[PDB]
Amino acid sequence: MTFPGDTAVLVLAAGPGTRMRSDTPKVLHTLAGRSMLSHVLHAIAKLAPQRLIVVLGHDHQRIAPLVGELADTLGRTIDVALQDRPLGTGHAVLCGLSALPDDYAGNVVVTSGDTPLLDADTLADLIATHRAVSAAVTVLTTTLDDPFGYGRILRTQDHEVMAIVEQTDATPSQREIREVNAGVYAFDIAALRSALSRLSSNNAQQELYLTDVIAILRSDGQTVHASHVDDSALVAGVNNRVQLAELASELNRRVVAAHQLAGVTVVDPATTWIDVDVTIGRDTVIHPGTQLLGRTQIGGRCVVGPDTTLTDVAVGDGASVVRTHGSSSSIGDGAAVGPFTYLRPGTALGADGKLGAFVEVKNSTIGTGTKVPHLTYVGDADIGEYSNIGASSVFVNYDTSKRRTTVGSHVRTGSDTMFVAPVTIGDGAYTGAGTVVREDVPPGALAVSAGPQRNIENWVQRKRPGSPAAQASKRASE
Amino acid sequence: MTFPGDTAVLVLAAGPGTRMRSDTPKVLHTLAGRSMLSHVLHAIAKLAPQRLIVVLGHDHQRIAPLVGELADTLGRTIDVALQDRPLGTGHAVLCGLSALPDDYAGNVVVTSGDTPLLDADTLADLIATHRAVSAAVTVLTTTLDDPFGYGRILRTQDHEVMAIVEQTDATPSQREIREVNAGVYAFDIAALRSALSRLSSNNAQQELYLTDVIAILRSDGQTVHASHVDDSALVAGVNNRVQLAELASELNRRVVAAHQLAGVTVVDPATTWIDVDVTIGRDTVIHPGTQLLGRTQIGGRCVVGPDTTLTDVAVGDGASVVRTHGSSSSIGDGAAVGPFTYLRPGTALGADGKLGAFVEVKNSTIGTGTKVPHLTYVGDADIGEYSNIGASSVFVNYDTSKRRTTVGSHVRTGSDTMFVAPVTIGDGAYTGAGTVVREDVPPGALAVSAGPQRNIENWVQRKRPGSPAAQASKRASE
Amino acid sequence: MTFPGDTAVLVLAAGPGTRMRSDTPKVLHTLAGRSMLSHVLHAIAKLAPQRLIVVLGHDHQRIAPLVGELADTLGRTIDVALQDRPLGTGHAVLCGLSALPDDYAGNVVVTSGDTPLLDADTLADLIATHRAVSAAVTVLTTTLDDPFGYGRILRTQDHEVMAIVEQTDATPSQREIREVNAGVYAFDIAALRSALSRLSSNNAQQELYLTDVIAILRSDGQTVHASHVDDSALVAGVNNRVQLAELASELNRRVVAAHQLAGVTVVDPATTWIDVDVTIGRDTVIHPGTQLLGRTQIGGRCVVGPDTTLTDVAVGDGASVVRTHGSSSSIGDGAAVGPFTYLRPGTALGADGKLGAFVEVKNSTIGTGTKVPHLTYVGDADIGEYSNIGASSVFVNYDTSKRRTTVGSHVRTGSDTMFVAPVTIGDGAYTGAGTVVREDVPPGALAVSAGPQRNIENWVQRKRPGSPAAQASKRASE
Ligand SMILES: CC(=O)N[C@H]1[C@@H](OP(=O)(O)OP(=O)(O)OC[C@H]2O[C@@H](n3ccc(=O)[nH]c3=O)[C@H](O)[C@@H]2O)O[C@H](CO)[C@@H](O)[C@@H]1O
Ligand SMILES: CC(=O)N[C@H]1[C@@H](OP(=O)(O)OP(=O)(O)OC[C@H]2O[C@@H](n3ccc(=O)[nH]c3=O)[C@H](O)[C@@H]2O)O[C@H](CO)[C@@H](O)[C@@H]1O
Ligand SMILES: CC(=O)N[C@H]1[C@@H](OP(=O)(O)OP(=O)(O)OC[C@H]2O[C@@H](n3ccc(=O)[nH]c3=O)[C@H](O)[C@@H]2O)O[C@H](CO)[C@@H](O)[C@@H]1O
Secondary structure (H helix, E strand, C coil): CCCCCCCEEEEEECCCHHHHCCCCCHHHHCCCCEEEEHHHHHHHHCCCCCEEEEEEEECCCCCCCHHHHHHHHCCCEEEEECCCCCCCCCCCCHHHHCCCCCCCCEEEEEECCCCCCHHHHHHHHHHHHHCCCCCCCEEEECCCCCCCCCCCECCCCCEEEEEEEECCCCCCHHHCCCCEEEEEEEEEHHHHHHHHHCCCCCCCCCCCCHHHHHHHHHCCCCCCEEEEEECCHCCCCCCCCHHHHHHHHHHHHHHHHHHCCCCCCCHHHHHHHECCCCCCCCCCCEECEEECCCCCCCCCCCCCCCCCCEEEEEEEECCCCEEEEEEEEEEEECCCCCCCCCECCEECCCCCCCEEEEEECCCCCCCCCCCCEEEEEEEEEECCCCCCCCCCCCEECCCCCCCCCCEECCCCCCCEEEEEEEEEEECCCCCCCCCCCCCCCCCCCCEEEECCEECCCCCHHHHHCCCEEEEEEEHCCC | CCCCCCCCCCCCCCEEEHHHHHCHHHHHHCCCEHHHHHHHHHHHHHHCCCCCEEEEECHHHHHHHHHHHHHHCCCCCCCCEEEECCCHHHHHHHHHHHCCCCCCCCCCEEECCCCCCCCCHHHHHHHHHHHHCCCCCCEEEEEEECCCCCEEEEEECCEEEECCCCCCCCCCCHCCCCEEEEEEEEEEEEHCCCCCCCCCCCCCCCCCCHHHHHHHHHHHHEEEEEEEEHHHHHHHCCCHHHHHHHHHHHHHHHHHHHHHHHHCCEHHHHHHCEEEEEEEECCEEECCEEEEEECEEECCCCEEECCCEEEEEEECCCCCCCCCCEEEEECCCEEEEECCHHHHHHECCCCEEEEEEEEECCEEEECCCCEEEEEEEEEEEEEECEEEEEECCCEEEECCCCCCCECCCCCCCCCEEEEECCEECCCEEEEECEEEEEECCCCCCCEEEECCEEEEHHHHHHHHHCCCCCHHHHHHCC | CCCCCCEEEEEEEECCHHCCCCCCCCHEEEEEEEEEEHHHHHHHHCCCEEEEEEEEEECCHHHHHHHHHHHHHCCCCEEEEEEEEECHHHHHHHHHHCCCCCCCCCEEEEEEECCCCCCCHHHHHHHHHHHCCCCCEEEEEEECCEEEEEEEEEECCCCEEEEEEEECCCCCCCHCCCCCEEEEEEECHHHHHHHHHCCCCCCCCCCCCCCCHHHHHHHHCCCCEEEECCCCCCCCCCCCHHHHHHHHHHHHHHHHHHHHHHCEEEHHHHHHEEEECEECCCCCHHHHHHCCCCCCEECCCCCCCCCCCEEEEEECCCCCCCCEEEEEEEEECCEEECEEEEEEEEEECCCCCCCEEEEEEEEEEECCCCEEEEEEEEEEEEEEECCCCCCCEEEECCCCCCCEECCCCEEEECCCCCEEEECCCCCCCEECCCCCECCCCCCEEEEEEECCCCCEEEHHHHHHHCCCCCHHHHCCCC
């Protein structure tokens, strides 16, 4: 942050990713609310290289679209190079180069589409070191407890880099090496072209190994330079779903920490999932088993969770959102939502409103200070202020009617009222318990439909004789 | 996988397990859906020894039954040796031997009933090494950060094994040894009998230590061989509930990983509990706070969780099961269940069906494409296809009547309908909101019981004067 | 446990705690159900020093009250020293000394208000070592992977302590030191006064560093002694919310372990939060995603969770409390609560009672063997024994009426009954489904209000023509 020039970045993304066992292209799997690809491109764009090229393989029609979207989001131009068949990483670099002017003179940085955690600094350091050491190729390495599967970096006691050897081609002895190839490079474009031209597919994998390039350039008498990255997580890639979840977990730790340091109490970081676009205000407390997803925004002094999932929800200041499942909705200041509350898209709850337990709202607006405390569904309706919706009620329209039920302010509807849409209820109106409202109700009016209660006096003895409820017999002689 | 012959396995399980502080025999505590005992016997049977014997103690009537069950499940014969009083591990081995022909000539492998994670390879390697080194006794060891409580393996600089010393009998110096006895052995039966005969109870515990046997056989000039196990977890035992939860956690990690590698996305492995018999199809996504228990089976391309608990539930392909608690039930392809949904035993939901929020179903069948979206209980009933059960409804029978309410296809029942079982509703029937159905309803018919809505016009002012709902007064002059 | 005399303890708590980014004083943030301050004072009081003094800063009116409360709770006297401005830790010690008689002769122990995990032993060892070594000052140290931010303890090869150097004032070389100052001290009061008098504010922070005192006393030719604490967590302090959550997590591990060792099965310790005052009986099983808060007490042989949150709830023996959110309530032996159940303050559920799914109770008593199984709200009411409250019902009073609805024993109320408070229902009474009870109901009586079901026979064809529910047409010709 930022890059020099002219710098061109290739992002290899044309591998089959068979180890994911997925019918969804590897780079499109997500963590923290962005696909791996989106993560990679966001970091790269922040460095603003002259050219940004994504090498894609056979399923490129499924991916190029996303790339164009990111191009626009990122305010820049991102090109696509094709590689019909995965003949190797080296071959992929060729294809990606084919999208540069044959006379390109800038540095060529190579990275992968499956390293979500890679950051601006690590890249900027990479090129900087590459220029300082006047290297023909610079390669990022890191050390792993288990180096299995990755390229072993061969050094002489000199610490001089000799070559990179793949897991498949390595000897048992070489496999003990725990310093591995990160797969992030900086090249002198001419040396890169030269070296690539000479690759051979005589491998355990019979492919064209981009990694062979550090060996040919050693042998060319060129400057070959490795650069160790300590924070190995930054350089970690995703080849299967085990590694996906580990990177997800690790990214999540960093996002949660940042929030904690900015004044957010997270009781249980290991159990609080927060996407990268989420914002949270000061002195807010998040309880365990909570996930805040998409573009969710929480104000200050809120209490969220436990066991709460919010996608693209906006929460004002001083609100409580407990054991709630919700998406695309707004909760105003000092509102109380939960526990056991479901908000569907389109829900807007005003300041000091209350959505209680076993309440669901979809596409509804609920005015300041209004309470829907119990066992109620509110669909496609607008409610006013300081009203009180009785328990066990339902606002529903049997459709595709786009007419909305309307309820005024200071209303008090009775337990078990069914509102058949579309209907209009006036300010300070009441409804009787067990009322079916099919007709508008005037301000100050009382709507009712329930019949009068009648008592059948010795009914249990007569029509349920001998039962335990022959405890009426006990009660009588007492 | 598999074993040589003749090989006889003793499983010591006759200890009191006092450190569990439980009124339930240690080996019967569970993890990942099997008792420790069931885990142990499953691994052993896979190796198919000639003889399999379980030594049990005083509460053997509570355990022998389970053993016979496992015998049948495992397709083999498992014997029981008794040890009335826990006089020691050595003594337990005697008792277990008493169930072999006095002239038994095979190798005797000894293991414990409290090591759930022990695997086939570790055992097969054990006997193999025992035969190769022509050992009189071979003993599995491993190294622990905290070796507290376990037998210290004493070696000379030779790496030669000299003896095993128990925590209780060890010196402060010996206690620093971090290589410990795993309690898994292979014996030459004759040397074992010989050695056991000579044990003495002159201990800190005043018991007959099976471990003394490696010392007497050293002194006998017999071949004594230790075999180190690196993956210490495999050899970890459960003596208290701290260790139980650690092994549970570790087993769970391995089960989740396997699923991830086979193409299942688990967002949060630390918070996803999956029993050993559960199956999950490709590209399925499991969200945090989910447990899949018993013989639950999930198809492909499903979304399960967050906060979902399924025991013996079957889920087709492309289904969503979110914030659901359920057991012994089936959810067909493309069905949507949750959030906040409860399925009790006997529930069968057809393809493309929907069980919504704050819905409970027990012992009911629900046809293809049928929706029960809100606040409804469906008990002991059968519903047809493409129907729509209105919110806030109840299907209940006041019993022990085994007659089932029946609802046809393309039905649309109105909000707040109570169905008193047993009743039959015909295809394309409707019910009015707030209807109590006690009588059959013919196809194409409309059932209703609710009264007409009536409005009492200035009622709030008259019977609740001065209230905030004197906002009718405001409304009138506006 | 216990302390010698005369021993005086100063608790520094007058720092601004800016790194918390909180409008709530650092020492008042909580973990495991106690503020850091309450944790600190509880441990100190258990040692019973002659004098206990808390140094507070500008917001002391917000804290001194809590201190007085703890004074009473702890059965002792705790004084407050003021320090108007945070001029440094050394300066804070002065202020705290100002609350001792000018001729005080006892030892002075200094500790911080932000070290929740500090235990009795570590303190008792501190003074004991201080007296043994006849030290003028003894200082607790510990070793950290990341020593960032803490005072580096400078030793000569002698292991002799030379000085403590702060992060801000340390050299890059000194910063590599990973042995750090714990900020827990024991002093000879005279040497302490002497040394403090000579402090200088010529610092990177330009403050009066209590830490300089170990240097002046070295230079005084006094005895200076460091004491290493291995369990670094005991000596860990909270300066930001990252460290808060880590200590919370670590404390929680220790509390859960203790319970496990006393015979409580916790399936998932990392996901089970248990406050310090909670009690749990033998053979109880706690499932993942559970938090037991405040003074919650669980009997024996219970099943609690998953996804259960209890604050100050009392649970008898053999009860199941599953996916329940509850506070200030009681659940009797063998009761079944959940899943998806909400208990508000004042709820008392008798033995063998059942609160089912999507049920909420507030301030209500529910007799032995009574069942409220589905979709019901029970507010401010008293129910008798072996009754059965039908699904989809509501007990609610439209208020501030303190009269309580009353229901007798062996009652069976029908699905969709609304009870308008206050009302009285007699033993063995029944209610019809869809009944609005506004009037008392006599024993053995049947209350009803619902109208008779009527059928409109070809209604779908007539008033919804062409619809899919023209499957009545199909049904007719079949
Ligand atoms: C380059 C090589 O020989 N091996 C390196 C490669 O191993 P590894 O075998 O992991 O390389 P992959 O097969 O993951 O591919 C690396 C990147 O190149 C892409 N790709 C691969 C082949 C292809 O024909 N087209 C294509 O675009 C992949 O989509 C991926 O984005 O990366 C590791 C870091 O994670 C390094 O330690 C290895 O030394
Ligand atoms: C055998 C011995 O002296 N000590 C070993 C024993 O310690 P440890 O003291 O853990 O042995 P336990 O008391 O757990 O018993 C070991 C096994 O033998 C059974 N049992 C024990 C006593 C008895 O009289 N009857 C009986 O059947 C127990 O149920 C258990 O299945 O196992 C440890 C491994 O976990 C080893 O490191 C110790 O060196
Ligand atoms: C004392 C000092 O120079 N540095 C020590 C201080 O660092 P550190 O910089 O962490 O010290 P803090 O600023 O946290 O304050 C330490 C304690 O003293 C209190 N306080 C501080 C300043 C003040 O003017 N008034 C006041 O009461 C704080 O509220 C806190 O309770 O504690 C660390 C342990 O956590 C040690 O490793 C450092 O060597």
